[PDB]
Design a protein around this ligand. Structure first.
Ligand SMILES: OC[C@@H](O)[C@@H](O)CO
Length: 734
């Protein structure tokens, strides 16, 4: 007998019933009772999928917005600004709106959770959702195992007075209080017949201190009387011996995202007093795997149970209807539903109920050797630009002829309903390619003339022809496919369809030349080429695992550099490369950052390997650069734009303290997440702060980030104020 587990199955539904329910309810289209009924249908669909494939059925997974927020509500962590917790009304206020909790990435994934704000030192059982869901399924004659976020990870993902609660001394006191509530929840479950509880502790894979583990041991000793099964994923646990010594009867390890868990288990063994649950089916990638190979790992480990490595919600629901993928790709893929079926196959095989498993091997599939070696024989010169910054700077400035404190923007422009409809009609084939392009040309012209009128120094074409930055390029690159319904939850009701890098990546034709060249033909002002970095493209896409990550990254980077070269040839003087994944794609373990940044840096530089006369702008809307400034410094950009409104310019500290910093900085002086129009005085405070140490010639003035989420009536007046401010600064520091 091989007990099979599974967790994190997508909640959105095959027809995206979840997204529609949430949105209809918010718009007032349906009632709370109707919203609930729809959610229960999804609940049944989920456990139905589980029941057909695995032995242990999870419950408490259908979150109405975020499971971390659900955990906070469970323990009473509701900020005072929300008043008494009413229910859904309060829940969504904490989730979205002007008073909502901060939203941030869940570990190193594309799912975003809500950051609990701990205002009190005493937790209490506000709502027992785990019990609620457990009883709901029991009433349907279905035994389930509540899926909950463990107490250590919960605090680890939370903040107290604006700071993370991550040091042992910051966690210790709160934990005793927190575990007491968990104890109450667990006791009630057991009293009601609950046989197993799935506790998620992914924080165990962070670079923890031995002091953290001392705290964790004490936490679980207090919960040793409950039927707990602890899961860890996204990487190897930070202290194997300490982890396996925890007083829990069942322990799960992710044997997919890392090799350390296995090596450590082979070297130190695994306790006889507890059972191992082998996470052997990947939840982060959509590739079919040779179940005979997986089977051998499980057999060597003598593991009594199996399951996916990490939550399945990082994958789309089903591959079933994906019948328009490039030839041969569909047969090598497997989404959430198929991953569950793989666990069933593995279970049956391991129990001798079957003696055969489908063969899986496609190493040569979609592999373009000529392009591969083009990257494998990479000579240093493709990673370092011809001349050093100081020399390039001299050449660029004489070429650009820009004033002190030049102004520009750094992203998309707002998209009217008309722009959206045209893109729609185009995708549906309602209109021709020539027709769509003509429309785009019109929007670009209007945008260019508007910037001219407003008085900006460096212009952008608006990107009215793009929706998702990564999808835009994925559709133009060979080796990358896009799905029709491969939806994956990002947060709340927001879903995205990750592209699939299934083979060697190359750029067959120019991807952005027509729009950029056209925009530039309308003005004497320099117009920016706008591209997305290599690491960002793969960060938002699924990709082959039988090739090192850095190779895929360099392949993409080379393709991007070809675009850069075509832009240069076309006379484009400035090229911006947005690489938000530079930090966002970094390992959860900062101890693994050296190896990661080595190639992330090389990938960007390969993509940005432009002629000395070509000004390269790197763009990243990070809230702080203190922990990565040393890596940033190795990127061969000429200008780097940052968001400085939130910190009122204090984010500049990482730059003024970097000895030898001499590159230009595009200072964001306007928060594009607010409809409010920044006053000239507000922006002035920011620029003045930035000018405290750094020389004035390094500074550019621009908005914080893209503008596509704002309306024109907000953008125009803010842009004019930005120009007015820059003009003022020039007179002052003339
Ligand atoms: O160390 C992991 C931390 O930086 C966050 O990604 C957790 O969500």
């Amino acid at each position: 007998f091989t007990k099979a587990y599974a967790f994190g199955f997508p909640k959105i539904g095959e027809k995206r019933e979840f997204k529609k329910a949430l949105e209809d309810f918010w718009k007032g289209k349906i009632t709370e009772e109707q919203f609930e009924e729809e959610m229960n249908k999804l609940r049944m669909y989920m456990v139905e999928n589980y029941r057909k494939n695995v032995d242990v059925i999870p419950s408490n997974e259908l979150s109405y917005y975020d499971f971390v927020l659900d955990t906070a509500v469970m323990v009473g962590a509701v900020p005072e600004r929300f008043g008494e917790y009413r229910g859904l009304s309060t829940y969504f206020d904490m989730a979205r709106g002007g008073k909502a909790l901060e939203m941030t990435k869940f570990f190193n994934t594309n799912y975003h959770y809500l950051v609990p704000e701990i205002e009190t030192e005493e937790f209490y059982l506000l709502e027992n959702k785990p019990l609620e869901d457990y009883l709901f399924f029991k009433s349907k004659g279905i035994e389930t195992a509540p899926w909950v976020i463990g107490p250590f990870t919960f605090l680890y993902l939370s903040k107290r007075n604006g700071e993370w609660i991550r040091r042992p001394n910051q966690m210790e006191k709160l934990l005793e209080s927190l575990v007491s509530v968990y104890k109450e929840v667990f006791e009630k479950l057991v009293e009601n017949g609950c046989k197993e509880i799935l506790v998620n502790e992914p924080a165990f894979v962070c670079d923890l201190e031995k002091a953290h583990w001392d705290l964790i041991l004490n936490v679980y000793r207090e919960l040793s009387e409950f039927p707990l099964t602890v899961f860890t994923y996204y990487d190897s646990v930070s202290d194997y011996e300490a982890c396996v010594s925890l007083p829990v009867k069942r322990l799960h390890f992710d044997f997919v995202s890392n090799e350390e868990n296995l090596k450590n288990l082979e070297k130190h063994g695994f306790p006889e007093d507890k059972k191992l649950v082998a996470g052997v089916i990947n939840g982060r990638q959509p590739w079919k795997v040779d179940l005979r190979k997986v089977a051998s790992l499980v057999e060597k480990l003598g593991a009594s149970a199996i399951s996916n490595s990490c939550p399945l919600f990082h994958l789309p629901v089903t591959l079933e209807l994906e019948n328009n993928l490039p030839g041969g790709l569909k047969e090598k893929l497997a989404f959430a539903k198929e991953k569950l079926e793989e666990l069933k196959m593995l279970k049956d095989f391991l129990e001798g109920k079957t003696f055969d498993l489908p063969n899986v091997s496609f190493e040569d599939f979609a592999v373009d050797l000529q392009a591969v070696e083009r990257v494998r024989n990479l000579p240093e010169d493709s990673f370092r630009r011809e001349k050093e910054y100081t020399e390039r700077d001299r050449i660029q400035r004489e070429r650009l002829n820009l004033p002190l404190f030049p102004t520009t923007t750094i992203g998309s422009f707002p998209q009217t309903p008309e722009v959206r409809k045209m893109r729609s009609k185009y995708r549906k084939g309602e209109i021709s390619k020539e027709e769509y392009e003509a429309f785009i040309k019109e929007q670009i012209k209007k945008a260019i003339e508007l910037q001219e009128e407003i008085g900006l120094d460096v212009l952008v074409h608006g990107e009215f022809e793009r929706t998702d930055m990564v999808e835009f390029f994925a559709e133009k690159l060979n080796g990358i496919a896009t799905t029709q319904n491969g939806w994956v939850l990002s947060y709340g009701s927001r879903c995205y369809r990750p592209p699939i890098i299934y083979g060697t990546v190359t750029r067959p034709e120019p991807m952005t030349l027509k729009e950029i060249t056209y925009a530039q033909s309308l003005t004497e002002k320099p117009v920016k080429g706008m591209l997305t970095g290599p690491v960002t493209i793969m960060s938002w896409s699924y990709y082959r695992e039988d090739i090192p990550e850095r190779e895929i990254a360099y392949q993409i980077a080379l393709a991007i550099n070809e675009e850069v070269k075509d832009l240069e040839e076309a006379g484009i003087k400035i090229v911006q490369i947005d690489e938000p994944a530079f930090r966002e794609k970094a390992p959860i373990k900062k101890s693994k950052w050296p190896e990661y940044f080595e190639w992330a840096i090389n990938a960007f530089n390969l993509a940005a390997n432009a002629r000395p006369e070509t000004q390269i702008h790197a763009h990243m809307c990070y809230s702080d650069f203190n922990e990565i400034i040393e890596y940033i410094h190795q990127l061969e950009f000429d200008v780097i734009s940052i968001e400085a409104s939130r910190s009122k310019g204090e984010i500049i500290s990482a730059f003024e303290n970097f000895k030898g910093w001499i590159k230009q900085i595009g200072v964001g002086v306007w928060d594009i997440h607010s409809p409010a129009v920044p006053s000239i005085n507000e922006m002035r405070e920011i620029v003045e702060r930035v000018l405290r140490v750094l020389p004035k010639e390094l500074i550019w003035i621009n908005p914080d980030c893209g503008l596509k989420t704002r309306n024109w009536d907000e953008v125009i007046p803010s842009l004019r104020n930005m120009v007015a401010l820059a003009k003022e600064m020039r007179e002052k520091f003339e």
